[PDB]
């Protein structure tokens, strides 16, 4: 693509000069790809740059008009010689930090960070999103942090850990980035991630039992829960109860199918029972005149 010029050392930097003009941005020179930024300085190592190939940031020299278009940006790695790493699969590289990113030929060595595995797309840019590796799903960040002036792209392409949203469904990656599935206890509470990994919220039927995960935060509930102007009792295991349930000495009746707590007179196998407005089963007394025995049965 670019020819007739020659690399030059000057002012502690490396430039590519052709006819007294410093190349800028993306250039392909004799089988290798380089990036010279907005004024010519040759880059090395980790770089967050506008994507190449369009023409708006390619084959340009400081003696030319630069289109105001603001192109998408992604991470790229350049060798210490400024040559782009044309990887389409994976590479072990040092964790992107503030010290080892955006540097240029002529600057001192960064500061060791820690080696990590980075995956790449078919155009040599760091890959983002979900990936399945060695039997597990990992989420490679697609977004950076904050906005405009204080925007931070460092997180992009990194393996996510802990609670993470996918832009929104929530997921939880373990200490090594592994996405959890099914029942998992996190911070002492239970969560159900099903088989796809997305966090369940609200009511969920799992293995023949009903459970209620916080409609917002997803954490499994237990004990008495007032849901939808109805009471339900969830065992310590979280599983919903149906039928008779004794809390202390007080009895309650959870609807045989839906599970909601009953109040008022109700029948169970022909026999009549009465529950107060709190659910407490009436026993050995009279209810509006009708006698109820020790089992709460309406006797004559
Ligand atoms: C793990 N994935 C999120 C990619 C699968 C469910 O869509
Ligand atoms: C991040 N979540 C709200 C999904 C977890 C509850 O702490
Ligand atoms: C069955 N759960 C996974 C909900 C917890 C009981 O230990
Ligand atoms: C457990 N159920 C989902 C059936 C009751 C709430 O509608
Ligand atoms: C006769 N009882 C009122 C006790 C039964 C509900 O119909
Ligand atoms: C036992 N309950 C929580 C259902 C009654 C309080 O009114
Ligand atoms: C189970 N009951 C609530 C019906 C009474 C004890 O037999």
* Residue linked to tokens 């310590």: 236
Residue 286 sits in the same domain as residue 195: yes
47 plus 179 within the same structural domain: no
Tokens describing residue 178: 């592994």
β-sheet bridge partners, residue 49: 74
Tally Cβ neighbours within 10 Å of residue 10: 11
How far is ligand 2, taken at its centre, from the CA of residue 137, in Å?
20
> Total structural domains in the chain?
2
Dist. CA 1 → ligand 6 center (Å): 78
Ligand 7 atom 4 nearest Cα: 295
Q: Both 193 and 279 in a single domain?
A: yes
N-to-C CA span, the chain: 102
Domain co-membership, 251 together with 133: yes
Pick from 143, 212, 136, 223: which is nearest to 172 by CA?
136
Residues 124 and 139 grouped into a single domain = no
Please indicate, yes or no, whether residues 46 and 98 belong to a single structural domain of this protein: yes
Q: CATH number, domain at 62? A: 2.10.270.20
Closest residue by CA, ligand 7 atom 5 = 295
Contact between residue 78 and residue 45 where contact means Cβ atoms under 8 Å apart? yes
Taking the CA atoms of the chain, what radius of gyration do you get in angstroms?
33
Q: Which of 112, 128, 144 is the last residue of a domain?
A: 128
Domain with 205 in it: what CATH number? 2.10.270.10
Q: Tell me which residue range forms the domain holding 251.
A: 129-300
Q: At what resolution in Å was this solved? A: 2.5
Contacts of 226 (CB under 8 A, 6+ apart): none
Domain end among 103, 128, 153 = 128
Q: Which of 41, 120, 57 is nearest to 85 (CA)?
A: 120
- State the chain's maximal CA–CA distance in angstroms: 112
CA–CA dist 130, 259 (Å, integer): 38
Please tell me whether residues 172 and 293 are part of one structural domain: yes
Q: Say if residue 197 is in the same domain as residue 107.
A: no
Token pair for residue 176? Answer: 């090594």
Query: Residues 6 or more apart from 171 whose CB is under 8 A from it?
Result: 139, 163, 164, 165, 179, 180, 193, 197, 198, 199
Instruction: Map tokens 């007394």 to a residue.
Output: 285
């Amino acid at each position: 693509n670019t020819t007739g010029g020659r690399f030059v050392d000057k002012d502690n930097r490396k430039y590519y000069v052709k006819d007294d003009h410093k190349a800028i941005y993306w250039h392909k020179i004799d089988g290798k790809t380089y990036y010279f930024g907005d004024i010519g300085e040759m880059v090395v190592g980790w770089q967050y740059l506008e994507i190449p190939g369009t023409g708006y940031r390619d084959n340009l020299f400081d003696n030319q008009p630069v289109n105001e278009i603001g192109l998408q940006e992604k991470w790229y790695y350049f060798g210490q010689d400024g040559a782009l790493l044309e990887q389409t699969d994976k590479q072990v590289l040092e964790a992107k930090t503030s010290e080892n990113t955006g540097k240029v030929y002529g600057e001192q060595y960064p500061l060791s960070a820690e080696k990590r595995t980075y995956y790449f797309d078919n155009n040599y840019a760091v890959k983002t999103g979900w990936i399945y590796e060695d039997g597990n799903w990992y989420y490679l960040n697609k977004l950076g942090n904050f906005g405009d002036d204080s925007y931070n792209p460092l997180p992009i392409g990194e393996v996510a850990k802990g609670w993470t949203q996918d832009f929104a469904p929530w997921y939880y990656l373990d200490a090594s980035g592994k996405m959890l599935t099914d029942w998992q206890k996190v911070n002492g509470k239970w969560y159900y991630f099903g088989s796809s990994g997305s966090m369940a919220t609200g009511w969920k039927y799992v293995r023949g039992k009903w459970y209620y995960l916080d409609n917002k935060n997803g954490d499994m509930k237990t004990g008495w829960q007032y849901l939808g102007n109805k009471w339900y009792y969830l065992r310590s295991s979280g599983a919903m109860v149906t039928g008779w349930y004794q809390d202390g000495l007080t009895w309650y009746y959870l609807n045989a199918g839906n599970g909601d707590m009953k109040t008022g007179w109700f029948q169970v196998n022909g026999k009549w029972y009465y529950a107060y407005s709190s659910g407490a089963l009436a026993v050995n007394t009279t209810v509006d005149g009708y006698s109820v025995n020790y089992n709460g049965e309406w006797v004559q």
